[PDB]
Amino acid sequence: QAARLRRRQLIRQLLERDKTPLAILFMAAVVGTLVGLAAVAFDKGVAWLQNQRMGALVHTADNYPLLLTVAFLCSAVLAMFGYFLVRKYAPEAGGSGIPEIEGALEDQRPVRWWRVLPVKFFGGLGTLGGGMVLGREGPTVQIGGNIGRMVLDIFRLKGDEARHTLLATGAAAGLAAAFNAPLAGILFIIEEMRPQFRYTLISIKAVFIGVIMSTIMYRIFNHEVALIDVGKLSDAPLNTLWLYLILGIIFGIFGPIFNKWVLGMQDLLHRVHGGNITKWVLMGGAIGGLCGLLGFVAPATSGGGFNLIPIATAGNFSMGMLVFIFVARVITTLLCFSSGAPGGIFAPMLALGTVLGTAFGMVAVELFPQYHLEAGTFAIAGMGALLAASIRAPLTGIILVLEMTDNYQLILPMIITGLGATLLAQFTGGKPLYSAILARTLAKQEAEQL
Amino acid sequence: QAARLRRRQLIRQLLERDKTPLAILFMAAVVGTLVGLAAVAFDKGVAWLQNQRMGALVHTADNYPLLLTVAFLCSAVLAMFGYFLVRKYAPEAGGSGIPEIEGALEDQRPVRWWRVLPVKFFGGLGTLGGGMVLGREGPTVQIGGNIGRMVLDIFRLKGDEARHTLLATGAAAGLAAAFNAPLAGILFIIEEMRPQFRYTLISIKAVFIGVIMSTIMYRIFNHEVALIDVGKLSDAPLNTLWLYLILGIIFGIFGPIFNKWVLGMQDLLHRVHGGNITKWVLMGGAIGGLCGLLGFVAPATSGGGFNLIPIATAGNFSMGMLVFIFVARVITTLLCFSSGAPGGIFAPMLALGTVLGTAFGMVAVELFPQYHLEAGTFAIAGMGALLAASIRAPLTGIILVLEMTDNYQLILPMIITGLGATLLAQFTGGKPLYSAILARTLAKQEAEQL
């Protein structure tokens, strides 16, 4: 008897499908333009801070320790400013922000646009211009979601659909304009950040409008220079796909170890300061001054993670340097992100994945010679593999790497590794990172209520 | 006040995420291999039948009307076989198949793998080798869904998640092996074919296994024959994006008119025969014969439409011929899909979109000289536009055209034309075609449920 009414409802629902009102479809363009302006202001600010920190070496270019000490000092105070702002005015700004946007899409974790926008925009600017290794997409995604919550009370719009829709398209535009990827912004909304346990009416056309009205405002400035440039590499033949599957096995068995390391280092770095604000700011300044000293000398194991990647793929880079770069980048990414720093972790995961991919490719080109292999394709194949192993977002983790490279023909070696890094991460016994940070924060929020 | 237990359940849900059983994840590989085998068997059979229908002219290459009438006769009987099959044995194999899989995934529309596979695999072979304007997409997606139901009663696997997951990965691999696109096959499922109103539990990873396990089986049998081969066209600068927006407005004002034309032609060709099986298969023979005739003479306005796109973009063509090609293609697609013949209207939408894109580009290169334009860019921007304006699937309509063309440098004109198509196809008042066909057959089912 239930089949009589569900078809009567399904006919009435299908004859009015994908019909979203013009109020939402126009308010999703102003948030796209605003996030597109704010993201390029963020990028110009971090580029200006990096340029002035690189130009500060010519003041005293004679003494080595007294030359690195002033770089350590400015990278320390530029991170203490951001840490002090985050711990004082809005403690929700810490971490990567994508778990709090995911929480705000499911009615917990209240977003405060009046409070957390001009502490994120001025704290992430400091701790990203200070040479720390953080992906500059996390603050842009949180800034996008909070600009979406800003322009819903500024223009006083009402409804239990608009506060899902504008909150989604802001966090789509923030991921689109931080990577110059106008498709990964949509595919990180419809795959990961949407609530996977409840049906919501997130307007996909409004997400489209916000993504293109932020990608246009990203491409008006800094015209067509990409964040990563590498030419059309060698095509991957059919008989070598099992090597990419083996790389997926390695990445999937590495992923949950990285998640356990991050979730343990968070407890350790919280225990070493005990909740004291001044001790936390001093520890953040010390841990950022490490990030800036390695940005000054031996500059490969620091920075945003986009000055290292295109020279590892199809480039001269020895394995003895490569294993040190991998170990040091694990250490300094674990120090940066797992310390409450305002900053996301996509670009360090992409850098770790492409360094381990270059390592596996340099192993395979000497171990299996009869395929006439190239070591450059394994870096592009394993770029979107640590994302598929630790975020468990293996469709946008492949679409982003296909987007920012313009190297199509290894889409099947990319997608094999993107599957095999999630199969042997589920069967290993891991959890997704951006769904575990939200669970930990929700447990900490609930356990305070006695 | 109700947040004393729902977030406590949300913590338990978020900790246990992406935990798919190994039985589902292993049954999602045998369906991938079987769809990858059946699709390339379908493609090799339709290629062989096209080869015999093309080599039949060598036997009688002296007389024009006696050469044309035997082509008319074989193209008529090759469609009468498919029409007689689809009307005698399984009447649910008509049309496209994606509505009869989307309705099957809503736990309506009962799947019959014992009855729909050996009618589609032998009738959609004949009506596509005969030369009708049908895609090889619908008959592969429906064969995929029926295989996904076949290996669930073969292995007698019981579940409330497996009967949607296998039915989803079959219709994922059916689109992935029809275009050599292992990303459009997933982005058709997680965007369009899933339940858009009810909360479902389609596991993303088990679609993701079967897509690559079908793409490998595709590429292992067809060596290197790409679908569409056009070179790297000139990238659109940011002062001519409004031309792609205007093309999107034209496509959006065309889209619902095309949908209403198809929906009207369905009732017209239903009323012209009145349920008579012999009159219907004679109508199918006439509509196959007067499409194989245009396959022989003036061969642009027939076929799947993939022997036309490299001539349309980056090729010499006249607008006075292109107008006739467009109107004849709309007439023959209207007469071929909307007549119950087993064939998807997906490739005759791609060909129509790139024809209208070339017709916009060859107007704009003359009307706007100072832009230093190139007419082949607008064809690639308009190929992914009729899907966004009539199927209203504007994400897979962009990812698929990015797959089978390999032109990333115009991804922003492509996405602008796609959403400018869906905006003026929503504000005109149209419905998506795959959600209108399902609503019409559900209403026809409710009519006979007295």
Short mmCIF file of C-alpha atoms in Angstrom, two decimals, chain B residues 40-437:
data_model
loop_
_atom_site.label_atom_id
_atom_site.label_comp_id
_atom_site.label_asym_id
_atom_site.label_seq_id
_atom_site.Cartn_x
_atom_site.Cartn_y
_atom_site.Cartn_z
CA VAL B 40 33.40 -3.86 -26.34
CA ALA B 41 31.44 -6.81 -27.76
CA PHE B 42 28.67 -4.31 -28.54
CA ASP B 43 31.16 -1.90 -30.14
CA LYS B 44 32.90 -4.60 -32.20
CA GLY B 45 29.55 -5.96 -33.38
CA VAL B 46 28.24 -2.56 -34.42
CA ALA B 47 31.58 -1.82 -36.12
CA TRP B 48 31.39 -5.10 -38.06
CA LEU B 49 27.77 -4.44 -39.05
CA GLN B 50 28.70 -0.93 -40.21
CA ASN B 51 31.59 -2.47 -42.16
CA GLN B 52 29.26 -4.87 -44.00
CA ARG B 53 26.73 -2.08 -44.63
CA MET B 54 29.54 0.05 -46.08
CA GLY B 55 31.05 -2.80 -48.11
CA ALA B 56 27.70 -3.72 -49.64
CA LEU B 57 28.12 -0.86 -52.14
CA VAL B 58 31.17 -2.54 -53.71
CA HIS B 59 29.05 -5.49 -54.91
CA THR B 60 26.79 -3.16 -56.95
CA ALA B 61 28.74 0.01 -57.81
CA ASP B 62 27.26 0.71 -61.25
CA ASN B 63 23.61 1.72 -60.81
CA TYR B 64 22.43 4.55 -58.57
CA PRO B 65 18.78 3.66 -57.71
CA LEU B 66 19.46 -0.09 -57.60
CA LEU B 67 22.42 0.73 -55.35
CA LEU B 68 20.29 2.92 -53.08
CA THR B 69 17.35 0.52 -52.70
CA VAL B 70 19.44 -2.36 -51.34
CA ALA B 71 20.96 0.01 -48.74
CA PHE B 72 17.42 1.14 -47.91
CA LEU B 73 16.32 -2.50 -47.58
CA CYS B 74 19.17 -3.66 -45.34
CA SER B 75 18.95 -0.56 -43.14
CA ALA B 76 15.21 -1.23 -42.88
CA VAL B 77 15.49 -4.91 -41.93
CA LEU B 78 18.35 -4.27 -39.48
CA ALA B 79 16.02 -1.91 -37.61
CA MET B 80 12.95 -4.14 -37.95
CA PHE B 81 14.84 -6.92 -36.15
CA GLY B 82 15.52 -4.64 -33.19
CA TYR B 83 12.00 -3.19 -33.19
CA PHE B 84 10.37 -6.64 -33.32
CA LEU B 85 12.66 -7.81 -30.51
CA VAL B 86 12.05 -4.82 -28.21
CA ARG B 87 8.28 -4.92 -28.70
CA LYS B 88 7.83 -8.71 -28.54
CA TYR B 89 10.02 -9.78 -25.64
CA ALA B 90 10.86 -6.91 -23.25
CA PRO B 91 8.96 -3.63 -23.76
CA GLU B 92 11.00 -1.86 -21.07
CA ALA B 93 14.11 -1.82 -23.28
CA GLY B 94 12.73 0.95 -25.49
CA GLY B 95 13.73 4.58 -25.48
CA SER B 96 17.05 5.37 -23.84
CA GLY B 97 17.40 3.12 -20.79
CA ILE B 98 18.71 5.69 -18.32
CA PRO B 99 15.11 6.53 -17.25
CA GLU B 100 14.43 2.81 -16.78
CA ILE B 101 17.56 2.55 -14.63
CA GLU B 102 16.88 5.74 -12.62
CA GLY B 103 13.39 4.41 -11.95
CA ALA B 104 14.89 1.04 -11.07
CA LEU B 105 17.15 2.74 -8.54
CA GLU B 106 14.14 4.35 -6.80
CA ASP B 107 12.89 0.80 -5.98
CA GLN B 108 10.23 1.18 -8.66
CA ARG B 109 10.54 -0.22 -12.23
CA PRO B 110 11.42 -3.91 -11.68
CA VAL B 111 14.69 -5.03 -13.24
CA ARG B 112 14.51 -8.09 -15.50
CA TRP B 113 18.06 -9.18 -16.33
CA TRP B 114 16.86 -12.50 -17.77
CA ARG B 115 14.69 -10.66 -20.31
CA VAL B 116 16.29 -7.28 -21.08
CA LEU B 117 19.94 -8.28 -21.69
CA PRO B 118 19.32 -10.66 -24.66
CA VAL B 119 17.00 -8.18 -26.29
CA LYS B 120 19.11 -5.03 -25.86
CA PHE B 121 22.38 -6.78 -26.80
CA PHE B 122 20.81 -8.06 -30.05
CA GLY B 123 18.44 -5.22 -30.93
CA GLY B 124 20.54 -2.19 -30.07
CA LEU B 125 23.25 -3.88 -32.09
CA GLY B 126 20.96 -3.97 -35.12
CA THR B 127 19.37 -0.54 -34.81
CA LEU B 128 22.81 1.05 -34.38
CA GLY B 129 24.49 -0.88 -37.18
CA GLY B 130 21.57 0.02 -39.44
CA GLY B 131 22.65 3.65 -39.36
CA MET B 132 20.10 5.39 -37.14
CA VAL B 133 21.06 8.48 -35.12
CA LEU B 134 21.32 6.84 -31.74
CA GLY B 135 24.07 6.89 -29.21
CA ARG B 136 25.93 3.81 -28.11
CA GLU B 137 25.40 5.06 -24.55
CA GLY B 138 21.84 4.19 -23.54
CA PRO B 139 22.09 0.55 -24.64
CA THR B 140 25.35 0.24 -22.72
CA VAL B 141 24.10 1.91 -19.52
CA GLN B 142 20.97 -0.27 -19.45
CA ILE B 143 23.02 -3.41 -20.18
CA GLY B 144 25.26 -2.30 -17.33
CA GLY B 145 22.39 -1.93 -14.88
CA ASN B 146 20.92 -5.28 -15.89
CA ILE B 147 24.32 -6.95 -15.41
CA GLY B 148 24.52 -5.24 -12.01
CA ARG B 149 21.23 -6.90 -11.13
CA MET B 150 22.27 -10.19 -12.78
CA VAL B 151 25.31 -10.66 -10.57
CA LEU B 152 23.33 -10.14 -7.41
CA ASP B 153 20.97 -13.09 -7.93
CA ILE B 154 23.76 -15.17 -9.48
CA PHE B 155 25.71 -14.79 -6.23
CA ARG B 156 22.37 -14.55 -4.26
CA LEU B 157 23.77 -11.65 -2.22
CA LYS B 158 21.15 -10.19 0.12
CA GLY B 159 21.27 -6.56 1.17
CA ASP B 160 19.57 -3.19 1.24
CA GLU B 161 22.78 -1.47 0.08
CA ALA B 162 24.03 -3.96 -2.51
CA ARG B 163 20.85 -3.86 -4.62
CA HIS B 164 21.42 -0.13 -5.18
CA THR B 165 25.23 -0.19 -5.25
CA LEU B 166 25.56 -2.87 -7.94
CA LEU B 167 22.71 -1.29 -9.91
CA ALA B 168 24.63 2.00 -9.72
CA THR B 169 28.07 0.67 -10.66
CA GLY B 170 26.64 -1.21 -13.64
CA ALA B 171 25.12 1.98 -15.03
CA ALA B 172 28.40 3.72 -14.15
CA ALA B 173 30.55 1.27 -16.10
CA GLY B 174 28.07 1.36 -18.98
CA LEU B 175 28.76 5.03 -19.50
CA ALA B 176 32.47 4.66 -18.74
CA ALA B 177 32.98 2.05 -21.48
CA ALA B 178 30.84 3.89 -24.03
CA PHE B 179 33.06 6.98 -24.36
CA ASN B 180 36.47 5.85 -22.97
CA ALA B 181 35.72 8.28 -20.12
CA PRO B 182 36.44 6.88 -16.64
CA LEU B 183 35.30 10.09 -14.93
CA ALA B 184 32.02 10.86 -16.70
CA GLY B 185 30.85 7.38 -15.72
CA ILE B 186 31.12 8.37 -12.06
CA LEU B 187 29.92 11.95 -12.47
CA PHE B 188 26.76 10.75 -14.16
CA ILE B 189 25.97 8.62 -11.10
CA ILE B 190 26.81 10.92 -8.19
CA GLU B 191 25.14 13.92 -9.88
CA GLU B 192 22.19 12.78 -12.01
CA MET B 193 21.24 9.12 -11.68
CA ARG B 194 21.13 8.82 -7.90
CA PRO B 195 17.89 9.56 -6.01
CA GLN B 196 17.71 13.35 -5.94
CA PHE B 197 15.02 13.57 -3.25
CA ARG B 198 15.40 10.50 -1.03
CA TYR B 199 18.49 9.73 1.02
CA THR B 200 20.29 6.74 -0.46
CA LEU B 201 23.38 4.68 0.32
CA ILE B 202 25.25 4.29 -2.96
CA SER B 203 28.85 3.60 -1.96
CA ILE B 204 31.17 5.86 -3.94
CA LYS B 205 34.08 3.40 -3.94
CA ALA B 206 32.22 0.44 -5.43
CA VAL B 207 31.23 2.54 -8.43
CA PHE B 208 34.89 3.59 -8.49
CA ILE B 209 36.10 -0.02 -8.71
CA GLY B 210 33.77 -1.03 -11.54
CA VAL B 211 34.54 2.05 -13.62
CA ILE B 212 38.25 1.25 -13.83
CA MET B 213 37.61 -2.50 -14.14
CA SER B 214 35.52 -1.71 -17.20
CA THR B 215 37.88 0.95 -18.62
CA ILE B 216 40.81 -1.50 -18.47
CA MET B 217 38.72 -4.11 -20.30
CA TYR B 218 37.79 -1.49 -22.90
CA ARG B 219 41.37 -0.33 -23.56
CA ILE B 220 42.64 -3.93 -23.58
CA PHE B 221 40.56 -4.67 -26.71
CA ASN B 222 40.52 -1.42 -28.63
CA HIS B 223 44.19 -0.49 -28.93
CA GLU B 224 44.60 3.24 -29.53
CA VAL B 225 41.55 4.48 -31.44
CA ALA B 226 40.53 7.68 -29.63
CA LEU B 227 37.00 9.01 -29.94
CA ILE B 228 37.56 12.61 -31.08
CA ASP B 229 40.96 13.85 -32.25
CA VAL B 230 41.37 17.63 -32.41
CA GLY B 231 44.46 19.57 -31.45
CA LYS B 232 45.15 22.19 -28.81
CA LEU B 233 42.97 25.10 -29.89
CA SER B 234 43.64 28.72 -28.97
CA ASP B 235 42.74 29.56 -25.39
CA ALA B 236 39.99 32.12 -24.90
CA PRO B 237 41.20 35.35 -23.24
CA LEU B 238 39.10 36.93 -20.52
CA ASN B 239 37.57 39.61 -22.77
CA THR B 240 35.53 37.14 -24.87
CA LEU B 241 33.87 35.04 -22.14
CA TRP B 242 30.59 36.88 -22.66
CA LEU B 243 30.38 35.34 -26.14
CA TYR B 244 30.33 31.92 -24.47
CA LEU B 245 27.71 33.31 -22.09
CA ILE B 246 25.60 34.38 -25.09
CA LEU B 247 26.04 30.90 -26.59
CA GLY B 248 24.83 29.54 -23.26
CA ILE B 249 21.76 31.79 -23.43
CA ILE B 250 21.01 30.54 -26.96
CA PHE B 251 21.40 26.92 -25.85
CA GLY B 252 19.21 27.50 -22.80
CA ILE B 253 16.45 29.02 -24.88
CA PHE B 254 16.76 26.07 -27.28
CA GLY B 255 16.85 23.25 -24.69
CA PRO B 256 13.29 23.00 -23.35
CA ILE B 257 11.98 23.48 -26.89
CA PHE B 258 13.95 20.37 -27.89
CA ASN B 259 12.62 18.52 -24.83
CA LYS B 260 9.02 19.46 -25.65
CA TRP B 261 9.58 18.48 -29.28
CA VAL B 262 10.78 15.02 -28.20
CA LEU B 263 7.89 14.64 -25.74
CA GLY B 264 5.41 15.67 -28.44
CA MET B 265 6.90 13.37 -31.07
CA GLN B 266 6.57 10.48 -28.61
CA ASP B 267 2.79 10.92 -28.39
CA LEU B 268 2.58 11.60 -32.14
CA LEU B 269 4.37 8.39 -33.12
CA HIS B 270 2.41 6.53 -30.44
CA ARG B 271 -0.92 7.74 -31.83
CA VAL B 272 0.10 7.02 -35.43
CA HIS B 273 0.24 3.28 -34.66
CA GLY B 274 -2.08 2.82 -31.66
CA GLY B 275 -0.27 -0.02 -29.91
CA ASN B 276 -0.23 -2.28 -32.98
CA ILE B 277 2.98 -4.31 -32.97
CA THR B 278 3.13 -4.97 -36.73
CA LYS B 279 2.28 -1.37 -37.62
CA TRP B 280 4.90 -0.23 -35.10
CA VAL B 281 7.66 -2.41 -36.53
CA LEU B 282 6.72 -1.31 -40.06
CA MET B 283 7.02 2.29 -38.84
CA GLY B 284 10.40 1.37 -37.38
CA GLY B 285 11.45 -0.14 -40.69
CA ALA B 286 10.43 3.01 -42.54
CA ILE B 287 12.22 5.23 -40.01
CA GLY B 288 15.35 3.08 -40.29
CA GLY B 289 15.26 2.96 -44.07
CA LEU B 290 14.87 6.71 -44.41
CA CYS B 291 17.90 7.14 -42.18
CA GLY B 292 20.16 4.57 -43.84
CA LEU B 293 19.33 6.38 -47.08
CA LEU B 294 20.79 9.57 -45.60
CA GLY B 295 23.64 7.45 -44.28
CA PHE B 296 24.42 6.59 -47.89
CA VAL B 297 23.75 9.92 -49.65
CA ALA B 298 24.83 13.10 -47.78
CA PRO B 299 26.35 11.04 -44.94
CA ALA B 300 26.63 13.88 -42.40
CA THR B 301 23.02 13.65 -41.18
CA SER B 302 23.18 10.04 -39.94
CA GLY B 303 25.32 7.77 -37.80
CA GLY B 304 26.27 8.26 -34.18
CA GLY B 305 27.61 11.73 -34.90
CA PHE B 306 31.28 11.03 -34.11
CA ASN B 307 32.39 11.13 -37.75
CA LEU B 308 31.28 14.77 -37.83
CA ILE B 309 32.90 16.57 -34.87
CA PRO B 310 36.53 16.68 -36.21
CA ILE B 311 35.10 18.11 -39.44
CA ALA B 312 32.98 20.62 -37.50
CA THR B 313 35.64 21.95 -35.13
CA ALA B 314 39.06 22.90 -36.55
CA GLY B 315 37.78 22.25 -40.06
CA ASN B 316 36.55 24.03 -43.16
CA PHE B 317 32.76 24.15 -43.41
CA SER B 318 30.12 26.56 -44.73
CA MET B 319 27.24 28.04 -42.73
CA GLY B 320 24.77 27.54 -45.58
CA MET B 321 25.50 23.83 -45.34
CA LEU B 322 25.67 23.88 -41.53
CA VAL B 323 22.10 25.21 -41.24
CA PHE B 324 20.86 22.25 -43.29
CA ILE B 325 23.02 19.86 -41.24
CA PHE B 326 21.56 21.23 -37.99
CA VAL B 327 17.91 21.11 -39.06
CA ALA B 328 18.29 17.66 -40.64
CA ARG B 329 20.04 16.37 -37.51
CA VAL B 330 17.22 17.66 -35.27
CA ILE B 331 14.64 16.07 -37.59
CA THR B 332 16.36 12.69 -37.72
CA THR B 333 17.17 12.62 -33.97
CA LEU B 334 13.54 13.49 -33.21
CA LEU B 335 12.37 10.73 -35.53
CA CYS B 336 14.87 8.12 -34.29
CA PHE B 337 15.09 8.41 -30.49
CA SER B 338 11.46 9.36 -29.93
CA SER B 339 10.14 6.20 -31.62
CA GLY B 340 10.89 3.44 -29.10
CA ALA B 341 14.09 2.28 -30.81
CA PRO B 342 16.80 1.10 -28.38
CA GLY B 343 19.33 3.91 -28.40
CA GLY B 344 20.41 6.72 -26.13
CA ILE B 345 19.90 10.34 -27.14
CA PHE B 346 23.28 11.41 -25.83
CA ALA B 347 25.55 11.33 -28.86
CA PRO B 348 22.92 13.04 -31.07
CA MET B 349 22.93 15.76 -28.41
CA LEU B 350 26.72 16.04 -28.44
CA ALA B 351 26.74 16.33 -32.25
CA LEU B 352 23.92 18.91 -32.22
CA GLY B 353 25.76 20.90 -29.57
CA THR B 354 29.01 21.04 -31.51
CA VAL B 355 27.16 21.89 -34.75
CA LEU B 356 25.48 24.86 -33.05
CA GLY B 357 28.84 25.75 -31.50
CA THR B 358 30.46 25.86 -34.94
CA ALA B 359 27.52 27.92 -36.21
CA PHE B 360 28.09 30.39 -33.38
CA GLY B 361 31.85 30.49 -33.92
CA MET B 362 31.64 31.12 -37.66
CA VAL B 363 29.24 33.99 -36.98
CA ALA B 364 31.37 35.46 -34.19
CA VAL B 365 34.70 35.29 -36.07
CA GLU B 366 33.22 37.55 -38.76
CA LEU B 367 31.16 39.80 -36.48
CA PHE B 368 33.99 40.37 -33.95
CA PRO B 369 37.34 40.61 -35.77
CA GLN B 370 39.25 42.54 -33.08
CA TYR B 371 38.98 39.59 -30.67
CA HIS B 372 41.26 37.61 -33.07
CA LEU B 373 38.93 34.69 -32.61
CA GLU B 374 38.85 31.08 -33.86
CA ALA B 375 35.60 29.28 -34.67
CA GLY B 376 36.68 25.87 -33.37
CA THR B 377 36.69 27.02 -29.74
CA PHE B 378 32.95 27.66 -29.69
CA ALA B 379 32.21 24.16 -30.99
CA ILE B 380 34.06 22.65 -28.03
CA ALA B 381 32.32 25.12 -25.73
CA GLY B 382 28.94 24.20 -27.20
CA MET B 383 29.42 20.44 -27.28
CA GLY B 384 28.82 20.42 -23.53
CA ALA B 385 25.78 22.67 -23.72
CA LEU B 386 22.77 20.72 -24.98
CA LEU B 387 23.28 18.26 -22.12
CA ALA B 388 23.28 21.17 -19.67
CA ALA B 389 20.17 22.65 -21.30
CA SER B 390 18.06 19.53 -21.92
CA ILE B 391 19.38 16.67 -19.79
CA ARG B 392 20.21 19.31 -17.12
CA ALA B 393 23.28 17.32 -16.05
CA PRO B 394 25.74 20.21 -16.33
CA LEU B 395 28.64 18.60 -14.44
CA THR B 396 28.98 15.36 -16.37
CA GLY B 397 28.20 17.39 -19.49
CA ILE B 398 31.44 19.27 -18.80
CA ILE B 399 33.57 16.37 -17.52
CA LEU B 400 32.68 14.17 -20.51
CA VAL B 401 33.62 16.85 -23.04
CA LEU B 402 36.83 17.41 -21.09
CA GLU B 403 37.43 13.65 -21.31
CA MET B 404 36.93 12.98 -25.02
CA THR B 405 38.52 16.17 -26.35
CA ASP B 406 41.52 16.90 -24.05
CA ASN B 407 41.28 20.70 -24.13
CA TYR B 408 41.67 21.98 -20.59
CA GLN B 409 42.54 25.56 -21.61
CA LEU B 410 38.87 26.40 -22.30
CA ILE B 411 37.38 24.80 -19.17
CA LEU B 412 36.07 28.21 -18.09
CA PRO B 413 34.21 28.87 -21.39
CA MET B 414 32.88 25.30 -21.17
CA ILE B 415 31.54 25.72 -17.62
CA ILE B 416 30.22 29.22 -18.43
CA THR B 417 28.31 27.90 -21.45
CA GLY B 418 27.03 24.96 -19.38
CA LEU B 419 25.55 26.98 -16.55
CA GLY B 420 24.39 29.72 -18.92
CA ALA B 421 22.53 26.91 -20.64
CA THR B 422 20.93 25.54 -17.48
CA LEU B 423 19.98 29.02 -16.16
CA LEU B 424 17.90 30.02 -19.19
CA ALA B 425 16.55 26.48 -19.45
CA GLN B 426 15.25 26.65 -15.89
CA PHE B 427 13.92 30.21 -16.23
CA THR B 428 12.21 29.33 -19.51
CA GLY B 429 10.30 26.56 -17.75
CA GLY B 430 11.74 23.27 -18.93
CA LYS B 431 12.34 19.98 -17.16
CA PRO B 432 15.28 17.57 -17.51
CA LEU B 433 14.57 14.93 -20.14
CA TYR B 434 15.62 11.93 -18.06
CA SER B 435 13.32 13.10 -15.26
CA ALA B 436 10.47 13.82 -17.66
CA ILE B 437 10.55 10.43 -19.42
#
